[PDB]
């Protein structure tokens, strides 16, 4: 199943360490996030919010980039990856109406998204989900997990991305920091 | 709503003229297709099949291609466009695992999808829906409508697309021919 759901409330496999409402309307603070590999129509009991998304095909990466990523990127659910961050992102209408060459160019040519991100591997594992096409309030759910030794680095990476040309098109962002139970 | 449903059965705005089961398992012949702008969970009565998909962003086309398209493409629902064709398509796993340059190269550089399609405008109006990400049996719903004068040309377009390098990755195709009621 390509669909993943994230419910904030009182149960789950992850403990909320903090929520930072970086840009736009935030998410309600909760104790835990429950992560399910399927849809959830039935709004669980004592739950503040539900995010969902699907895994999909590659939209921007070229073959050489894919090859570099595969050389180094870690698997999920390594024993030592006890910290996680879930970061929902929405981009602007003006981003979405641009053509495929235009977005590619802002993403890599000007922003160096992949080249920059590669400097933080293999410390950081990641998953990417899409949800604009489902009509969610966010366009993407991003997922990162790592050992604590890598926390400072991850924080450096966030600040680099947010200085990029790409991030001028980001109109909503929340970081949910977690700890594995 | 970006979601569209197509219900084959005994009612709808469109009459089935014929169905051609071009490649893979076919669809049952029905009298009518009912088209709805929304998700439909409840399979209507006396209905043989439901297709669905969503309108999404551009995945391949570059700015100049977009500009060329906008200059000549017709709107849907012209009074003259009394014929339509719904064409579901599934592409192979080998296509989906390819990187974005690879796919782009096969789509335009090798198959001239956009350049070839442009020759059939403004006679032909079109809409593209995506459904792989929803778990559907097909990856895409393609929709075409035109006045009868253009039926010949449209048939010619189909045979050209099917001769392209792109069509080598196509593992499932049905033509549903329709007449507006
Ligand atoms: C940690 C190393 C990172 C790597 C190696 C990396 C790599 C990538 C790659 C290769 C893509 C393109 C996927 C495709 O072609 O479909 C991508 C997309 C994305 N990444 Fe990252 N990324 C990293 C970190 C981050 C971080 C920290 C964020 C956000 C805080 C982020 C946000 C995004 C978003 C939103 C997309 C989707 C862009 C779109 O489709 O418009 N990435 N990432
Ligand atoms: C009539 C003129 C046509 C034009 C101008 C045309 C144009 C296009 C364009 C520009 C795209 C790319 C959209 C994007 O970047 O996301 C596209 C996608 C597509 N077209 Fe066509 N098209 C035409 C006819 C057809 C026909 C007859 C078929 C199939 C029988 C077809 C099947 C597709 C499919 C499946 C896609 C999605 C490709 C993918 O993501 O792999 N088109 N079309
Ligand atoms: Cl990914
Ligand atoms: Cl379209």
- State the method: X-ray
Residue B61 Cβ inside 6 Å of ligand 2? The answer reads yes
Nearest to A154 by CA among A130, A172, A178, A129: A178
Rounded-to-10 torsion of CA A110, A113, A116, A119 = -160
Residue B157 Cβ inside 6 Å of ligand 2? The answer reads yes
Domain harbouring B135, CATH code: 3.30.70.3420
**CB-based contact A49:A98 (threshold 8 Å):** no
SS3 A39: coil
Give the span between the Cα atoms of A59 and B102, in whole angstroms. Answer: 11
User: Does B130 lie at the interface with A, CB-CB under 8 angstroms?
Assistant: yes
Both tokens assigned to A134: 């489902």
Closest residue of A to B65, CA-based? A99
The secondary structure element, H or E, covering residue A13 is: none
SS3 A77: coil
Nearest to A63 among B63, B96, B102 (CB): B102
Closest residue of B to A39, CA-based? B134
Number of structural domains in chain B: 1
Q: What is the domain extent for residue B75? A: 1-181
Per the DSSP assignment, residues forming a β-bridge with A172 are A90
Give the span between the Cα atoms of B61 and B108, in whole angstroms. Answer: 9
SS3 A170: strand
Which whole-number Å values give the CA distances from B177 to A109, B34, B63, B85, B171, in the listed order? 44, 13, 32, 5, 20
Alpha carbon B77 to its chain's center:
16
Distance A46 CA to ligand 3 centre (A): 31
Give the span between the Cα atoms of B83 and B79, in whole angstroms. Answer: 11
Measured in angstroms, the resolution is: 2.7
**CB-based contact A53:A35 (threshold 8 Å):** no
Nearest to A99 among B61, B132, B133 (CB): B61
User: Residue B76 CB: number of other CB atoms within 10 A?
Assistant: 12
Atom of ligand 1 nearest to the CA of A175: 30
Partners of residue B132 in chain A, C-beta under 8 Å: 56-57
The secondary structure element, H or E, covering residue A108 is: none
Residue A89 Cβ inside 6 Å of ligand 1? The answer reads yes
Partners of residue A59 in chain B, C-beta under 8 Å: 59, 100
Give the span between the Cα atoms of B86 and B162, in whole angstroms. Answer: 16
User: Does A99 lie at the interface with B, CB-CB under 8 angstroms?
Assistant: yes
Per the DSSP assignment, residues forming a β-bridge with B32 are B9, B15
| Site from B106, B133, B134 to mutate, A interface, most A CB atoms within 10 angstroms | B133
Q: What angle do CA B165, B138, A65 make, to 5 degrees?
A: 55
Q: What is the DSSP string of chain B?
A: --EEEEEEES-SSEEEEEEEEEESS-----SEEEEESS---S--TTEEEEEEEE----SS--HHHHHHHHHHPPPTT-TT--EEEEEEEEE-HHHHTS-HHHHHIIIIIIT-HHHHHHTTTTT-EEEEEE-GGGT-SSSEEEEEEE-GGGHHHHHHHHHHHTTSSGGGGEEEEEEEEEEE-
Chain A / chain B CB contacts < 8 angstroms: 55
CB contact under 8 A, A135 and B1: yes
**Assign residue A154 a region: left if phi > 0, alpha if psi is -120 to 50, beta otherwise?**
alpha
């Amino acid at each position: 199943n390509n669909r993943y759901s994230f419910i904030g409330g009182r149960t789950g496999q992850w403990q909320v360490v903090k929520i930072r409402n970086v840009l736009g309307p935030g998410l309600q603070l909760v104790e835990k996030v429950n992560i399910l590999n399927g849809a959830v129509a039935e709004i669980p009991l004592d739950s503040a919010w539900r995010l969902q998304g699907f895994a999909s095909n590659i939209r921007y990466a070229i073959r050489t980039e894919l090859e570099a990523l595969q050389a180094v990127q870690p698997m999920l659910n390594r024993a030592e990856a006890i910290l996680a961050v879930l970061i929902p992102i929405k981009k602007s209408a003006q981003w979405w109406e641009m053509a495929q060459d235009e977005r590619r160019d802002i993403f890599e040519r000007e922003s160096h998204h992949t080249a920059v991100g590669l400097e933080y591997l293999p410390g950081v594992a990641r998953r990417l989900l899409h949800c604009r096409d489902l009509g969610e309030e966010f366009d993407f759910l991003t997922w990162f997990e790592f050992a604590p030794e890598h926390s400072s680095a991850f924080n450096e990476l966030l600040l680099r991305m947010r200085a990029s040309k790409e991030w001028e098109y980001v109109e909503r962002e929340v970081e949910v920091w977690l700890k594995r139970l």
